[PDB]
């Protein structure tokens, strides 16, 4: 990685192996620049902790497993971090619906920035399948 300008987040694969992977939908995060740089510069979020679910109209992204360390002080919240991430209007609601009644889930996988915000991707399994063992 020499040329380019474009930083890799997150990062997982377990839910593939344990969870068929079916659908997979696109959001975008998008927060200040501060905060941008500390977590480019660092290099650490979330690893087998964090989980993403669908409300309202778009993708939300929840993370338990904060690696970074923004916070000094004595006076903070819970480490979750909640982000909003755009989507659609029908497949939002589509997803929804079949994903979660019929018996799916929804986890986070990759999510870098480049020129200068984040975009996650989002993978759809199931609790195994096919082969019962």
Do not use: C
Request: positive net charge; charged residues 35%; aromatic residues 10%.
């Amino acid at each position: 990685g020499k040329s380019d300008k474009i930083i890799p987040i997150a990062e997982n694969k377990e839910a593939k192996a344990k969870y068929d992977i079916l659908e997979t939908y696109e959001a975008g995060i998008v927060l200040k620049g501060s905060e941008v740089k500390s977590l480019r510069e660092k290099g650490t979020v979330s690893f087998k902790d964090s989980f993403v679910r669908i409300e309202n109209g778009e993708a939300w992204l929840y993370n338990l497993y904060i690696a970074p360390y923004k916070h000094a002080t004595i006076e903070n919240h819970d480490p979750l971090r909640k982000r909003k991430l755009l989507l659609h209007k029908r497949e939002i609601m589509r997803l929804y619906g079949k994903v979660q009644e019929k018996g799916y889930t929804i986890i986070p996988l990759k999510l870098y920035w480049k020129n200068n915000k984040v975009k996650v991707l989002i993978a759809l399994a199931k609790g195994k399948k096919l082969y019962d063992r």
